[PDB]
């Protein structure tokens, strides 16, 4: 149930010999150093804590510097934790190594990332609200919300009403994506799909939960 953290490198295509174009995305997979192994006895639950990337020393706090030093690993750009089980905590020891070898070609994986942020967005784009008449006497409410409720009964707006607000820039998971190719010497992970976020953003890849 454990995965790895990567960085979105952009999209491309993979051509099959039969003459099909596969829309793929490239995920750079640096070393995932294991910074802590949490178990049911010390933490109440089993998980693996990993780090990847690098940070300069001036940008690493003393508390983090000691957290990494106990593991014996270099400070990464972030710290991510994967919920595991007894079978997953087999060869995973403190300061260990997690490469792209975790995945094999043809395996369905779950990729999570932060979506591109659109900022404040109206109901038309945020919630697929129908636009109102561009002509036919329509006043200054072309992309307006329309009605937001009923009359005196209930005399309020219900909670969860679809309205303008912040769009994107949220955690989003795409399921059922195939691993097109794995290359570990160069830290490659080619995956079929779209992978929420922009180029350069951190993405987490885990084995698919649907199965």
């Amino acid at each position: 149930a454990i995965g790895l953290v990567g960085k979105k490198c952009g999209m491309t295509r993979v051509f099959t010999e039969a003459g099909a174009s596969i829309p793929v995305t490239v995920v750079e997979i640096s070393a995932n150093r294991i910074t802590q192994v949490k178990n049911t006895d010390v933490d109440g639950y089993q998980a693996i804590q990993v780090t990847t990337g690098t940070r300069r020393d001036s940008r690493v706090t003393a508390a983090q510097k000691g957290h990494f030093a106990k593991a014996g690993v270099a400070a990464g750009r972030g710290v991510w934790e994967f919920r595991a089980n007894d079978s997953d905590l087999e060869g995973r020891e403190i300061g260990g190594e997690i490469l792209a070898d975790l995945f094999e070609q043809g395996q369905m994986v779950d990729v999570t990332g932060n979506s591109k942020g659109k900022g404040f967005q109206g109901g038309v784009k945020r919630h697929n609200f129908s636009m109102q008449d561009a002509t036919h006497g329509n006043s200054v409410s072309h992309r307006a919300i329309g009605s937001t409720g009923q009359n005196q009964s209930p005399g309020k707006v219900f909670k969860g009403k679809k309205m303008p607000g912040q769009m994107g820039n949220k955690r989003v998971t795409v399921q059922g994506l195939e691993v097109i190719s794995v290359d570990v010497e160069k830290g490659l992970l080619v995956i079929k799909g779209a992978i929420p976020g922009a180029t350069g953003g951190d993405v987490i890849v885990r084995p698919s939960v649907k199965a």
Partner: protein, 119 residues
């Protein structure tokens, strides 16, 4: 949205913005030290430096190309006369921005734009 976009609007049309930075570049080439708004100072680096780069090698085509973008035969002659063979060995960064506070009339952030090497 504005993702990965470049350029300024500065509450002007594009024709006005183009003419305003042409005037600023000519003024900076003449006096070599001007005081302007900090957002304008930062964007002036993107219209004034590429003219200095192209004047590092002097030719009729380059001389005529500068005049197309500057429309000042006094500053184009100065650009290829002294500004060219002063930044020949300098790989960019021909001018520096120094913040100089706020404007009295409207409290706009001000900055001096100075050419490097004795402006």
């Amino acid at each position: 949205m504005r993702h990965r976009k470049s350029g300024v609007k500065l509450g002007r049309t594009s024709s006005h913005r183009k003419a305003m930075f042409q005037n600023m570049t000519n003024s900076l080439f003449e006096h070599e030290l001007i005081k302007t708004t900090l957002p304008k100072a930062k964007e002036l680096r993107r219209v004034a430096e590429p003219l200095i780069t192209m004047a590092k090698e002097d030719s009729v085509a380059n001389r005529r190309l500068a005049f197309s973008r500057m429309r000042s035969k006094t500053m184009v002659g100065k650009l290829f006369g002294t500004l060219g063979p002063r930044y020949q060995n300098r790989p960019g960064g021909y001018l520096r921005i120094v913040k100089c506070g706020n404007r009295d009339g409207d409290n706009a952030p001000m900055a001096y734009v100075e050419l490097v090497d004795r402006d």
